[PDB]
UniProtKB/TrEMBL annotation, chain A:
Species this protein is from: Trypanosoma brucei brucei (strain 927/4 GUTat10.1)
Phylogenetic placement of the source organism: Eukaryota, Discoba, Euglenozoa, Kinetoplastea, Metakinetoplastina
Protein name listed in UniProt: LysM domain-containing protein
From TrEMBL, chain F:
Gene designation: Tb07.13M20.50
Protein name, as recorded: Uncharacterized protein
Source species, domain of life: Eukaryota
GO CC, one annotated term: mitochondrion
TrEMBL record, chain G:
Residues of the full protein shown: 341 to 389 of 631
Designated gene of the protein: Tb05.1P6.750
Protein name stated in the entry: Uncharacterized protein
TrEMBL record, chain H:
Keyword Ribonucleoprotein: yes
Annotated GO biological process: translation
Protein name (database record): Ribosomal protein S9
Gene assigned in the entry: Tb08.28F14.630
One matching Pfam family: Ribosomal_S9
Organism: Trypanosoma brucei brucei (strain 927/4 GUTat10.1)
Alphabetic keyword roster: Ribonucleoprotein, Ribosomal protein
Amino acid sequence: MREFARFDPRKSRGNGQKGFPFRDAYLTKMNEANQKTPPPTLETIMDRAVREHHQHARI
Amino acid sequence: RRGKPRPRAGMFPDKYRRVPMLLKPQQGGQQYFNHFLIRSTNDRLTQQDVDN
Amino acid sequence: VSTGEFDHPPFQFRQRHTFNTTPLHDANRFGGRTAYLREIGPVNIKKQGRRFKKDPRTVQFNVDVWCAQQTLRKRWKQRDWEVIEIPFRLVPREQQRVIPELYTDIPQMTDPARNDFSNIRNKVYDREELQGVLFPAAGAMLYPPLQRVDKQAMTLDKYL
Amino acid sequence: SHSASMPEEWREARRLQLVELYNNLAMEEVERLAPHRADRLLKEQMKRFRGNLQQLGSGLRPTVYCRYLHTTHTAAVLLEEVHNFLWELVPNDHPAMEIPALQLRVPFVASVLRRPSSVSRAEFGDTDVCAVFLAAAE
Amino acid sequence: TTAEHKQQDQFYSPENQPISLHRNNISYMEDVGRSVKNPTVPGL
Amino acid sequence: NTFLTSSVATPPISVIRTGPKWWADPERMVRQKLMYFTLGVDQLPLRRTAVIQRDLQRFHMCKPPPRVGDSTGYKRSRAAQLNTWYRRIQYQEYHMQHLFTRHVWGLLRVYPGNTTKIQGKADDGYVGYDSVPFHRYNRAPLPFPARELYERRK
Amino acid sequence: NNDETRDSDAQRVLRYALRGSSAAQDSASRTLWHSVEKVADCRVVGRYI
Amino acid sequence: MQKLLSPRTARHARLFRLAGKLADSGSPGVPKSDGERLVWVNSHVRRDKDISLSQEEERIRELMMPLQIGVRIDEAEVDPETGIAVGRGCADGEKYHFTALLRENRDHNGIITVMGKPLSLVLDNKAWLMEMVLMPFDEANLDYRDFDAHIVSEGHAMPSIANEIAAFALRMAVANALVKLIPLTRIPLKKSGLLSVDRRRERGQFPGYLDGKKVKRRFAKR
RNA sequence: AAAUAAGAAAUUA
C-alpha cells in the first residue's frame, strides 16, 4: 500500500517486476465502474439522523 | 484386508483426530449470550414484583 | 471464475448410470464431444480397443483443446468491433501517444489527467464519430449522427 | 461522607466530581440496557443512581432523562419516569396533586426553580424541565 | 461479579451452557400417532 | 431430459446414507424445493428431511453420548426407534421426489431415462435406443425409431 | 383522529400557550418570561388554525 | 376523491421536518426535492411499523415454542494510514491460503470481494458457503455493513473456489483480520472456534494405490 | 478395496 501511494508510471521504466504497481490497487483504479461510489443509503442516513437529533445519542 | 477380516471400527485411530476440540461441535451463537443474560436478569426482577 | 468443468475424470472401475454417477464418456460431458473419446460396449481387452482413448495424458490434452475452443469462441462472440488501421494524424487525442505492445509494459491508462483511467487497449470507438475520417469520399454522412441524452433535462426520472 | 475534617472547597470539589461521575455512569448504563428491551432492570438501575445522587444533594441531570425517555417502550414507564424526574427536584413533603387516572402524585415544582428577579432565556429552571416534558411528548 | 468473569466467562462453552456435545441427538420431534406392529413385510 | 440410458437402481437406504454428499447436498435439495414450490404445493417432507440432515451435519464430528449398561435395553431400543423414524421420514421424501419428478416430466413432454415409468404415459417402462434391442423387462422387441409418448406439436 | 374532541383540545393547549403557565397567581416572573420568548409563537398559532 | 401527499400523522410531520433540516446542512445523499423527501418519510415510518410487527410476532411465538488466563487479548495491529488489518486462512495445508484485508466503511455500505470479484459471484450464489463468511461478523456482534473486505488467494489457484473447504479457509481469514482490527472481539471468536485451524490434507499421491491415494490393488490367494 | 478433507456410530481380550 505504501509503495502504491508513491507510485508514478514514469519511474517504472527500466525496472523489471519492481516497476509494476501493486496489483489490486492499480487494477481497482483502472476499473471505471468502481469510479462511482454510492451515497450512504436513505435508510442509513435517516437512522443516524434520528438517533443524533431526535434521541440525543450519536451512532 | 487380504483374505483376512476387517478390523473393528475402534481399532483405527480417531477419524477426526486432526480437527481441534473447539470445532467439534462449534459453539456458535455467541452473539446471543449477553442478550439472554440480560433477559433472564430482567425476568427475575419481574418475578419479585409478583411475590412482594 | 467459471463453474464449468476443465478436467477429464480419472479412469477407475467402470462407472455406470446411477443416482449421483454417470458413465465416463457419457454424452452429457464436454457438450457431447466425448463421442470422440468413446469405445462403445463391453470391450474385449486382449483383442480390441483404441489405446489413446484410455490414456490419461492424451485424453486430457484433447479436452484441453476443446476448452480452449470454447473460450476463444466466446471471446470472439464478445467483440463488437473491427480493428481499423488509421494514420496517426486523424486519430483522437488519446491515441496520439506511444502505445507499448501487448504484455510489454504495465497495463496502460488512457488519460489520467482527464480523470479517465481505463485500458487504452480495450477502449472502443464509435463508427459514427470516426465517420469523417473513415469515409471521406462519400460527401453526405452515411451514418446519421448519434443522438445523445441531456442529463440536465427535466425528464420522468427527475420526478418532473 | 466519612470526611467532615477537610476544607469545604475540597468537599465541594469532590462532590461535584462525584455527581459528574454518577451521571456519566447512568447515561452509559442506559445505552447499555436499552437495545435489549430490559425495561424493569433499567428502571431499577436508575432507581439506584437517583437514590445515590439525592444523598449527594443533586439529581440525574435533565440530559440523561431525555436520553432515557427516548428509549422507553411501555407508556406506563414513560409517565412514571417523568413523574420521578419531577419528584427529584423537590423534597418529599412538598405540595402535590393526585392524578387518579395514573394513580400518581405530581409535585408542584415552580416554587423551587431558579428565577432571575437584560435577562436571557437560560436563567429559568423552566427551560430545563420543559426539555424533559418535550422529550416525553416526542 | 468480577469484571474479569464478565469479560471472559460470559460466553457459551463446554463449561457454561454447551450446545449438545454429542452425536445422534434428537433433531426433530413431532406429536404423532404410533404405527402398527411390524408394518414392514418380510421379503425375498 | 438429457440422460437417457439404462440405469442401475440403488435401494433407498443406501441413497440416503450418502448424507451431505448427495441426498442432502444443499444444491440438490434446493432445486427439489423449487419444483414443489412452483407446482404450488408445500414441501413438508423436504423440510423435515432438511431439518434432520442439517442437524446430522452439525454434530457429525462428535462422539456419541456415553452408554451405561442396562438389562432392559430400553435405551438401545429408543435410539433404534428414533433412528428408524428418521429413516422413514426420509423414505417418504425420496418417494416424493421420484414421484413428482416423473409427473412433471409427463407434463413437460420429457422422455425419461431407459426403463422408467411415467404414470399416465408409459406404464411399463419407457425405452428407446437401448444398447439391447428388446425392452429389457418385458422381453418384447423395440421399434425403430424410438417410441413417442407425446403428440407432435411443440 | 377524534373529531368530537380535538377542537376542545387545540383550544386547551392554546389557552396554556397564551397564559404561559398554569400557576394560579400571576407573577412578575411569568411576565419576564413572556418578554424573553414567545410562547404563542407562529408555530403554535399556525398549527392551531 | 384524491389522497393528500402532505404528511398524514404527527410522526410523518416530525420526520419530514428532520429530512428538511438534513437537506439544508447539505449532507451527502440527502434528497434535494420535496417529493423524494415525502417518499422517504412515508417509507421510513412504514419500516418502523414493520419492525414493531416483527417484535410482536416474536413475543407471541416465544410462548408456543416446543421446548487462570482466559483468552489472549492483544492490541490492534492496523495500518495507521489506510486503517487496514490483515488475517490469513488455510485449509488443506496447501490448497487454500487466503488473506483478508479488512477495513472499516463509514458510509455503512460495506462489501466483500474475493480476488477482485464480488463474493456472490465467487462462491456461486450458494448460500451455505457465503454464510460461513458472514459468521465472524455475527459472533463478534457486528454489522457486516460497517466493513469492507477484500480476500486474496495465495494458494493453488482454481477457476472455481466454490466448495465448503475453501469457504472454511475464507471464514478463517476474515475472522483473523477482524481480530487484528477489534482486539476484544477475539474472545467470542476464539470460543466459537473460528480462529481454530484444522490440519487435514488429502493423502499424498502414491503409485502403490490404484486411484493414486487410498485404494490398494487386487489380492488373490496364491 | 476403504474409517487419513472429509461427512458411516454401539455385541473387547
